[PDB]
Amino acid sequence: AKLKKMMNTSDSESTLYKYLKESKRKYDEIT
Amino acid sequence: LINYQVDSKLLPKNIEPPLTSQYSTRHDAPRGLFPFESYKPSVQLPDMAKLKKMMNTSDSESTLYKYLKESKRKYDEITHP
Amino acid sequence: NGLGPLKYAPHLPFSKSENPVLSTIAFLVGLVNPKTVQSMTQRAI
Amino acid sequence: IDTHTATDIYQTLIALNLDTTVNDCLDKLLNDECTESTRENALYDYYAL
Amino acid sequence: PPETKLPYPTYWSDKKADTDTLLYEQIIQRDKINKYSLIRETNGYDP
Amino acid sequence: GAVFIVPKILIREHERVILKQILQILDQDELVQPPLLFGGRHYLFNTFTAHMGVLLVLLQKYITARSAFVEFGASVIAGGQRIVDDYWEQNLSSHQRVFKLSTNLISKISLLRPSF
Amino acid sequence: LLKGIQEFGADWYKVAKNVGNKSPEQCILRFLQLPIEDKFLYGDG
């Protein structure tokens, strides 16, 4: 259950969602 | 097959040192034989991203996901005006 | 699913790609005298 | 190529797929608009998993 | 000439890609990769 | 005002989560009683809250939903656990049967665990 | 077989008499040979 909780792209406080968002932020800002 | 238990004797009683008894097994004990191994779950943001992209599916997951999308989108758009 | 275990090879997402396979190929073929490479295979120019 | 992390990913993916198929069997059980064959197959797949 | 911290690694080669600059990019990228993987090779992640 | 309705899929997923959670323990007592929103949290009822609606959800005019998820906590929201998913964060711990079980869920429990 | 093993964990005699017409050893063999996990493993072989 906890793993599927952390991999929840719908919930914005989920870790994976924040990681992906910040990664795209940085990636597009540099290029 | 015959006459094997003619003059049988009683076993007196055993003193049991640790680890010589029933129900003497542990989760933390080494798995010498018993070929099945336990692995460390890969919980790291890039590995999590990879797993999320490769995890299988389920129909209810897709329908509930798109419904969640639509409901939350209409909510956020109605809050603005 | 032609490539069996390459599916599970980790990689950073969205940024800063690394190429293990192509780097290994270019390293291993960079040692062998391009003329005998041209003789080895027809793929090479 | 990192082989240790690759095996870790392979094993964790196995576990996650088992869990999703168990959830889907529970789903096919909990709604009554499915047939009898589907429901029986779901129940016994649940038992096996 | 104060230090500037070198924004995104391919910063240089996006202006007049040359052989030396491209070799420099390759070198620094593979050095970072090697260091991180060695640290994780022996020790592992925080958990 | 605008009315937001809860589809059947959401309640089916709700009861699925509850079934799995209860099948998990099913054995430890004082965690299982004998009788029988900035997260991924949803309200489990139709929203404008008609008081008969919240009463129906609890038993299984209108009030603000924020008060409902103040007085009752987990009990109203779709997937509800003890300690988290509620508002007030004693002796209480997680993994408890906060939601009353219907006559159908108990038949399903008997189906899935014949040693019961 | 499946429902009996779900009822009684590893009581092979109760499972055998639940199935009927088959001995405990046949039940254990068939239980060990069931391919439950195989579809989730990497390849057919």
Curated annotation (Swiss-Prot), chain C:
Q: Which domain of life is it from?
A: Eukaryota
Quote the subcellular location field of this record.
Nucleus
Tell me more from the record: Present with 3150 molecules/cell in log phase SD medium.
Main function = Involved in transcriptional activation. Component of the SWI/SNF complex, an ATP-dependent chromatin-remodeling complex, which is required for the positive and negative regulation of gene expression of a large number of genes. It changes chromatin structure by altering DNA-histone contacts within a nucleosome, leading eventually to a change in nucleosome position, thus facilitating or repressing binding of gene-specific transcription factors.
* Subunit field text: Interacts with RTT102, SWP82 and the N-terminus of SNF2. Component of the SWI/SNF global transcription activator complex. The 1.14 MDa SWI/SNF complex is composed of 11 different subunits: one copy each of SWI1, SNF2/SWI2, SNF5, SNF12/SWP73, ARP7/SWP61, ARP9/SWP59; two copies each of SWI3, SNF6, SNF11, SWP82; and three copies of TAF14/SWP29.
Q: Quote the protein name from its UniProt record.
A: SWI/SNF complex subunit SWI3
Q: Which organism is it from?
A: Saccharomyces cerevisiae (strain ATCC 204508 / S288c) (Baker's yeast)
Organism lineage reads as: Eukaryota, Fungi, Dikarya, Ascomycota, Saccharomycotina
Q: Which residues of the whole protein does the chain here span?
A: 587 to 631 of 825
UniProtKB/Swiss-Prot annotation, chain D:
Subunit field text: Component of the SWI/SNF global transcription activator complex. The 1.14 MDa SWI/SNF complex is composed of 11 different subunits: one copy each of SWI1, SNF2/SWI2, SNF5, SNF12/SWP73, ARP7/SWP61, ARP9/SWP59; two copies each of SWI3, SNF6, SNF11, SWP82; and three copies of TAF14/SWP29.
Q: Which organism is it from?
A: Saccharomyces cerevisiae (strain ATCC 204508 / S288c)
Q: Where in the cell is it found?
A: Nucleus
What more the UniProt record tells us is: Present with 217 molecules/cell in log phase SD medium.
Function according to Swiss-Prot or TrEMBL: Involved in transcriptional activation. Catalytic component of the SWI/SNF complex, an ATP-dependent chromatin-remodeling complex, which is required for the positive and negative regulation of gene expression of a large number of genes. It changes chromatin structure by altering DNA-histone contacts within a nucleosome, leading eventually to a change in nucleosome position, thus facilitating or repressing binding of gene-specific transcription factors.
Official protein name in the record: Transcription regulatory protein SNF2
> Which segments does the entry list as coiled coil?
none
From Swiss-Prot, chain E:
Q: How does it assemble?
A: Component of the SWI/SNF global transcription activator complex. The 1.14 MDa SWI/SNF complex is composed of 11 different subunits: one copy each of SWI1, SNF2/SWI2, SNF5, SNF12/SWP73, ARP7/SWP61, ARP9/SWP59; two copies each of SWI3, SNF6, SNF11, SWP82; and three copies of TAF14/SWP29.
Q: Give its localization.
A: Nucleus
What name does UniProt use for this protein?
SWI/SNF chromatin-remodeling complex subunit SNF5
State the covered range within the intact protein: 316 to 362 of 905
Q: Kindly list the residue ranges recorded as spanning the membrane.
A: none
* Protein family according to the UniProt entry: Belongs to the SNF5 family.
What other remark does the UniProt record contain for this protein?
Answer: Present with 217 molecules/cell in log phase SD medium.
Which segments does the entry list as coiled coil? Answer: none
Curated annotation (Swiss-Prot), chain F:
| Function comment | Involved in transcriptional activation. Component of the SWI/SNF complex, an ATP-dependent chromatin remodeling complex, which is required for the positive and negative regulation of gene expression of a large number of genes. It changes chromatin structure by altering DNA-histone contacts within a nucleosome, leading eventually to a change in nucleosome position, thus facilitating or repressing binding of gene-specific transcription factors.
Q: What else is known?
A: Present with 3180 molecules/cell in log phase SD medium.
Outline the subunit composition: Interacts with SWI3 and SNF12. Component of the SWI/SNF global transcription activator complex. The 1.14 MDa SWI/SNF complex is composed of 11 different subunits: one copy each of SWI1, SNF2/SWI2, SNF5, SNF12/SWP73, ARP7/SWP61, ARP9/SWP59; two copies each of SWI3, SNF6, SNF11, SWP82; and three copies of TAF14/SWP29.
Name of the coding gene: SWP82
Cellular location of this protein? Nucleus
- Transmembrane stretches in the record are none
Coverage span on the entire protein: 25 to 244 of 623
Its recorded name reads: SWI/SNF global transcription activator complex subunit SWP82
Its family?
Belongs to the RSC7/SWP82 family. SWP82 subfamily.
Q: Which domain of life does this protein belong to?
A: Eukaryota
